[PDB]
C-alpha cells in the first residue's frame, strides 16, 4: 500500500508560521483521506469543488498539502474569495480553489504559559499575495531617508509580528493548525487516487 504521506503533514511536531507556510507535494500514491481523523483531533473541514464524502472515489494529477498555524478567528480567511490580514499578506487561496481546508485547535501543542512567539505573521505588504504566493522576507521596510541597517525603529518597519499564543486565550485567539489540501486536476495521467 503506497499511501500518501499525510502523517508527516498532519502529525508534524511543529507547524510553520503562516507567512512561511510549508508545502508538501503529494504525487504517485494512494490517498486514504479517512486516516485524517486519527492524525488531527476534532477538526474543522471545508471542501470546495469536491464533496467530502466522495474523496476516496476521486483521482487527481497531484495533491498539495500546505500547512501553517494561525489564530482561530483567522481560519475563515483560509477560504476562496476572502480578504483580510492573513488572506492579503500571508496565505491566499484563489477564488477557484479546488480542495479542502482542514483546521484544528492546537492550543495544547502551540500555546505556552509565557506566549509562543515563534509563530509569526506578516503585517503589511507592497501588494496582496497572489494564490499560493509565499513571502518569507524579513527585510525592514525603510520609509525615511535614513537606512535601517537591520534596526527597526523610526521610519523602519519590521514586517512581521508574533502571535504570542497563551493557553489563557479564548478559542478565537488560540492557535489552530491548518492544512490546505489542493486537488490539482490537469489533462494528464492521474497520480493520486483513493483506495477504491
Amino acid at each position: 500500500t503506497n499511501l500518501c504521506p499525510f502523517d508527516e503533514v498532519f502529525n508534524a511536531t511543529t507547524f510553520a508560521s503562516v507567512y512561511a507556510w510549508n508545502r508538501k507535494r503529494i504525487s504517485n500514491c494512494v490517498a486514504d483521506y479517512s486516516v485524517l481523523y486519527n492524525f488531527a483531533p476534532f477538526f474543522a473541514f471545508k471542501c470546495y469543488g469536491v464533496s467530502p464524502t466522495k474523496l476516496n472515489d476521486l483521482c487527481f494529477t497531484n495533491v498539495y498539502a500546505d500547512s501553517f498555524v494561525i489564530r482561530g478567528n483567522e481560519v475563515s480567511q483560509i477560504a476562496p474569495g476572502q480578504t483580510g490580514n492573513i488572506a492579503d499578506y500571508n496565505y491566499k487561496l484563489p477564488d477557484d480553489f479546488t480542495g479542502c481546508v482542514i483546521a484544528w485547535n492546537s492550543n495544547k501543542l502551540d500555546s505556552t504559559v509565557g506566549g509562543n512567539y515563534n509563530y509569526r505573521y506578516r503585517l503589511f505588504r507592497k501588494s496582496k499575495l497572489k494564490p499560493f504566493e509565499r513571502d518569507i522576507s524579513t527585510e525592514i521596510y525603510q520609509a525615511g531617508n535614513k537606512p535601517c541597517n537591520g534596526v527597526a525603529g523610526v521610519n523602519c518597519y519590521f514586517p512581521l509580528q508574533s502571535y504570542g499564543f497563551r493557553p489563557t486565550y479564548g478559542v478565537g485567539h488560540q492557535p489552530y493548525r491548518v492544512v490546505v489540501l489542493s486537488f490539482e486536476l490537469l489533462h494528464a495521467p492521474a497520480t493520486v487516487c483513493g483506495p477504491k
Partner: antibody
Amino acid sequence: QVRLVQSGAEVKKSGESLKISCKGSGYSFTSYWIGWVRQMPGKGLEWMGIIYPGDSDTRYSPSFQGQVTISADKSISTVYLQWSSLKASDTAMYYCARQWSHYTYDYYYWGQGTLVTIS
Amino acid sequence: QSVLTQPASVSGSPGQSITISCTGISSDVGGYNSVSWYQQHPGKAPKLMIYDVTNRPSGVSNRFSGSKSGNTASLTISGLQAEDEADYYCSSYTSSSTPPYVFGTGTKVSVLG
C-alpha cells in the same frame, strides 16, 4: 474550458501607437497571471512579462521593461499590450499565455497570436 | 537575465532518437520552479510537450521525454517522424527570478528525407 482569444492582425506605420488585447474565458480571470510572448519573424520566443488581472500587478522582463505597457481590464476579462510609438523592430507575432494551473507553472494555454506588422 | 542555450538545429532520420540540450538553467530551492519544453509548427502557437522537467500532458506522445542534469535540460525524441519537424523551445521558470520565465534560444529539428 480555458480560452485566450487575441485581437486580430495589425498593420501599422512606424511611430503609431497600438493596443492589442487578449480576452480570457472559461475560468476565473482574476485568479491567474497572464503572460505575453514576442516572436519576431523567423526568431525565437521571448517572454515579455506577466500581469495579474485581479490587481494589475505587472512583472516585465528586463528586456521589455519600459518598452511596452501591459495592462488589464478585469471587468471584461481582458489584458492588453500597448506601445506609444511603434518601431519596425516591433514587427512580430505576440502571444498571450497562461500557466496550466495554480500548481503547474508551465504555459499550457496559449492565445492564437496577434500578428503585428510595422511598415 | 540568463540565457538558455539550445543548438540552433538538430537532425535525424525517421525512426532515430535525437536529443536537444538546454544549458544554463538555474533554480531557487526556496521558491517555485519548472522546466518546460515547447513544440512549435509553422504558423501555430507553441505547444507544451514536457512540463515539470519530465512530465507529458495527455495526448503528447511518449516518444517525447525530458530530463535534467545540473544546469542542463534535455529533450529526447525517439522514433523520430515527419510530424516532429518543428522548432523546439526549452523554458525555465523560477518564481523569485527576474525574469521569472525564460525561453531557450530554440532548436530547429529536421527529419531527414
